[PDB]
Structure 1
Amino acid sequence: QCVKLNDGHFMPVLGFGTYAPPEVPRSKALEVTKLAIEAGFRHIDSAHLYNNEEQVGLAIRSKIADGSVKREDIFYTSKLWSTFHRPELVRPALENSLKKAQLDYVDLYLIHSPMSLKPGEELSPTDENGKVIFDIVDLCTTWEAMEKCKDAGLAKSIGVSNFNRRQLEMILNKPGLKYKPVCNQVECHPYFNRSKLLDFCKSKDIVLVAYSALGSQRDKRWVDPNSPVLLEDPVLCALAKKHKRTPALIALRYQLQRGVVVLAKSYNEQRIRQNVQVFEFQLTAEDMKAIDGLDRNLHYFNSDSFASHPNYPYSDEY
């Protein structure tokens, strides 16, 4: 179950989310990425920022060498981190990810975020008060360096993440554009369903890829503990009982039926195997309408640090 991207490549519509907080041992990413592949995940979502490409790569190499899958059956995503937006930094950043993952190419390379940061050793470069230092980079120059990565065969497809409509339009209207972004990977779940941005992406043949589709890991440093807990939503819970599924499976199936490509992070063997059950059942039109009604424009991730960035994607909300 794949979608045709606007460059003619194919993306599986269910993806495995590999981010775990830093407190989780790096060994787990190797263990659960192999379990995800065993359960039937073929789209694997990673990034420089996640500090796991060595382990995710090794799980992929392992399941190819064990005869479970071939390289072409796996759809591997990496992401260019915000310290590597300056165009001369882009290709060495991809080559560094390919070296860590020990893959020859990624299926998909994203601009992780439009919010450029100062280059350096540090992935979060901070001043004396822990205030992050921003960089002013025309992301069209970043996009041209991504396009060269595709021409070099190092990335099959290129796309973006955390972009709003205005920032997508900046790439779509770039003079001499060669490659449209195949996708925009954004926060998307029933409390933030991104219906308008979804329609916009559909009209431009850009796939919306949902992250935090199960309501995020609710890490204290990023997510207000007072925020409503998606998987305890009474409507999701009532729909789970109706279908004899789980709230997680309702939330994933919602995304599939609205033409969204959905990620699902789990480090738990039972839940990893449960999540592939999304292909096994259907929501009614009335079920879809009830989930649509849960929308509240709630982004789980907040940063007053990034709120002030010129490229803050939520920047003109109020």
Structure 2
Amino acid sequence: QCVKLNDGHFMPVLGFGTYAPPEVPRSKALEVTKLAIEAGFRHIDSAHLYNNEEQVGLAIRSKIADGSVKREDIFYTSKLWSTFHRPELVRPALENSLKKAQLDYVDLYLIHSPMSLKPTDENGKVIFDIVDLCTTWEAMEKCKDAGLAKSIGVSNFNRRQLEMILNKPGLKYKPVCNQVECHPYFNRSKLLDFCKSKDIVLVAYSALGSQRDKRWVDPNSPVLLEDPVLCALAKKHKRTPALIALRYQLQRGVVVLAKSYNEQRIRQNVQVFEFQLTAEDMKAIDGLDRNLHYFNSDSFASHPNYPY
């Protein structure tokens, strides 16, 4: 149920996505993260940006206190926000996340995105900052050495951006993973091949087609789970299009996140371990790739470090 990371730690291959939009009451993250642990999720994905680390933390603490799980059974990820890339800001950001969650360590700390921000303009484009991410990475390594994070990694990096870290003089720890948008309409095959060649785990987010946030996502973009190929695979397997999309990533060797704030769907998504897709099913899903990143807004697309 886990994969061994390149620093010797283990990451469960199914993770629970904890982001919900601002209109969902903060209290809901506490309820649903408890439900996710009850259903059998052990990898829990959060971030400073999600404004939910207090609630997600309390859910973890509550399920430890009631005997359901031990802390060593949970794999909890947080992430460094883009206004904290200057290296002197990295360990204080991580300490803040640890304080909000009331944890002694995170299992994984990620650079959330390569697009550094000043610690929006009149045009509505984010105000970029120019930071050498190798210096941010050195600060992340110091966080692992201090024991604040068991493992460190990155998110939203392209090949070139990952290479800059991998080729850094005096590198101490490689990133254990690159968490990126990844689903049948944007399957990141070339990037997955590169990550495998460097023993970096690719972690898929928006694997179910994202929450379609108006800020970032064109409403005209076709809806992943209404795709007829996925719908026909779901009917053939007597599963659901979400379970087809999750199973596809596991069979490729990608670790997959799934967000749900619905009790039935949370319980459904752990069924991904209960069935397999055939070679022909996998080829049919591979045929859907159309270079569609749902995140697609003017506000980021002209950032100097935009990864697409």
TM, length-normalised to structure 1 = 0.96
Deviations 1:287-317 (A, max 9, x none): 001100011010001121211111100xxxx
Comparing 131-140 with 15-24, which one deviates more in the overlay?
Answer: 131-140
Deviations 1:230-268 (A, max 9, x none): 001101000000000000000000000000000000000
d(CA) in 1 for partners of 2:122, 2:24: 28
CA shift at 1:274, angstroms? 0.1
CA shift at 1:127, angstroms? 3.4
d(CA) in 1 for partners of 2:276, 2:123: 51
Deviations 1:72-105 (A, max 9, x none): 0000000000000000000000000000000000
CA shift at 1:130, angstroms? 4.0
Deviations 1:107-161 (A, max 9, x none): 000000000000xxxxxx8234544211100000000000000000000000000
2:106 matches 1:112: no
Q: How many residues align?
A: 308
Partner of 1:121: none
d(CA) in 1 for partners of 2:99, 2:213: 30
2:160 matches 1:166: yes
d(CA) in 1 for partners of 2:76, 2:154: 15
SS at match of 1:209: strand
Aligned match of 2:201 in 194, 204, 207? 207
Deviations 1:13-64 (A, max 9, x none): 0000000010000011000000000000000000000000000000000000
2:217 matches 1:217: no
d(CA) in 2 for partners of 1:162, 1:19: 16
SS at match of 2:258: strand
CA shift at 1:8, angstroms? 0.3
d(CA) in 2 for partners of 1:311, 1:302: 14
| Mapped contact 2:48–2:80 kept (Cα < 8 A) | yes
2:258 matches 1:261: no
d(CA) in 2 for partners of 1:248, 1:310: 34
| Mapped contact 2:126–2:303 kept (Cα < 8 A) | no
CA shift at 1:193, angstroms? 0.4
| Mapped contact 2:153–2:175 kept (Cα < 8 A) | yes
d(CA) in 1 for partners of 2:267, 2:122: 46
d(CA) in 2 for partners of 1:289, 1:155: 38
- Please identify runs of 4+ aligned residues in structure 1 that moved more than 4 A: none
SS at match of 2:246: helix
SS at match of 2:154: strand
Distance 1:199 1:131, change over 3 A: closer
d(CA) in 1 for partners of 2:6, 2:193: 16
d(CA) in 2 for partners of 1:216, 1:147: 31
Deviations 1:191-238 (A, max 9, x none): 000000000000000000000000011122111110011001101000
2:69 matches 1:69: yes
Deviations 1:147-177 (A, max 9, x none): 0000000000000000000000000000000
Comparing 171-180 with 217-226, which one deviates more in the overlay?
Answer: 217-226
d(CA) in 1 for partners of 2:139, 2:99: 19
d(CA) in 2 for partners of 1:254, 1:130: 37
d(CA) in 2 for partners of 1:231, 1:28: 24
d(CA) in 1 for partners of 2:56, 2:78: 11
d(CA) in 2 for partners of 1:304, 1:223: 11
